[PDB]
């Protein structure tokens, strides 16, 4: 059965990005997925997306810009303290000049740099670069 929805959405986006497609359809939708896509779009990696509202769980159509190298999910969602973040940055990101780790904190869903600015930890969801 399907047990992770963000994993399927990110895998579909990555596969469509490898093939040079212009748009991706991901179903089902989820507010976690919407937050993750918003974080990706704020940094210019995807572009505008539209939420198709059927009466059951919704769908998303996402535009692609060709700037995405890799987007992935981390399972299970490990608890990350503010002093252990640099280890995850070294393990997962390609360089220290670009790339983002996505965390769910009590303040909201954000990237690792915004979590350093707000001085909070949380649980790791995924990464993209």
């Amino acid at each position: 059965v399907r047990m992770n929805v963000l994993a399927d959405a990110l895998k579909s986006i990555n596969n469509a990005e490898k093939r040079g497609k212009r748009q991706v359809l991901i179903r089902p939708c989820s507010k976690v997925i919407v937050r993750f896509l918003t974080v990706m779009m704020k940094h210019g990696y995807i572009g505008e997306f539209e939420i198709i509202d059927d009466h059951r769980a919704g769908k998303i159509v996402v535009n692609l810009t060709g700037r995405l190298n890799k987007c992935g999910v981390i399972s299970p969602r490990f608890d990350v303290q503010l002093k252990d973040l640099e280890k995850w940055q070294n393990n997962l990101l390609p360089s220290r000049q670009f790339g983002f780790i996505v965390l769910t904190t009590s303040a909201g869903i954000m990237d690792h740099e915004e979590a350093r600015r707000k001085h909070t930890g949380g649980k790791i969801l995924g990464f993209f670069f």
Binding site: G44, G66, R67, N69, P94, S95, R96, Q97, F98
Partner: protein, 218 residues
């Protein structure tokens, strides 16, 4: 004396192309070895990595040929590798040098932390494959040096990299595959899309299109 047989060679000899980066921009194949001699010139230094005897079984007995591996570079951003098999060692070495300077690629260099001064390391983590051999390059802080095996270290020094961390997996005792994997990893540095390359590309006249009238004369 050099008499070019291609349009690119005629343009280069007639001093119509300023730098090798003009050729690299349009991904034009290089078929004449004298172009690299014209541009890079004295800064190129080469080194023989291995002489490998191979044998073909025949009715009378084994037939032996010698294969030379030659790496070349100017220690300032360009690197090449060549492999050549011949009946004699000297002929194989000459062919390997020609084939190595024919396949010369530029290397992109980046920073590990604060971007002060000249670039010193790889822009990001890059992986190269050949056979079972996998080679991974990781950025390193300034003053670290090259932490790798003797074979990749020569190519990394010839490319102009000062600091780098290296990982390798697979049968690295195969020197040819070990060298080709790290050469591929180095070549992949300019093909990686980083956020500072997101600007829209402004096109420019191709050397074939720009100097067509001069080519018609010659």
């Amino acid at each position: 004396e050099w008499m070019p047989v291609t349009k690119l060679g005629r343009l280069v000899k007639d001093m119509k192309i300023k730098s090798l980066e003009e050729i690299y921009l349009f991904s034009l194949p290089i078929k004449e070895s004298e172009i690299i001699d014209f541009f890079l010139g004295a800064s190129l230094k080469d080194e023989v990595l291995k002489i490998m005897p191979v044998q073909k079984q025949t009715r009378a007995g084994q037939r032996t040929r010698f294969k030379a591996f030659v790496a070349i570079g100017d220690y300032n951003g360009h690197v090449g590798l060549g492999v050549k098999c011949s009946k004699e060692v000297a002929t194989a070495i000459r062919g390997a040098i020609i084939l190595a300077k024919l396949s010369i690629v530029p290397v992109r260099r980046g920073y590990w932390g604060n971007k002060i001064g000249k670039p010193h390391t790889v822009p990001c983590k890059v992986t190269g494959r050949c056979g079972s051999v996998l080679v991974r390059l990781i950025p390193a802080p300034r003053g670290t040096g090259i932490v790798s095996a003797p074979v990749p270290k020569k190519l990394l020094m010839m490319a102009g990299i000062d600091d780098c961390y290296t990982s390798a997996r697979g049968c690295t005792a195969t020197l040819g595959n070990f060298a080709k994997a790290t050469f591929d990893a180095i070549s992949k540095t300019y093909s990686y899309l980083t956020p500072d390359l997101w600007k829209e590309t402004v096109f420019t006249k191709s050397p074939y299109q720009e100097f067509t009238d001069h080519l018609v004369k010659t």
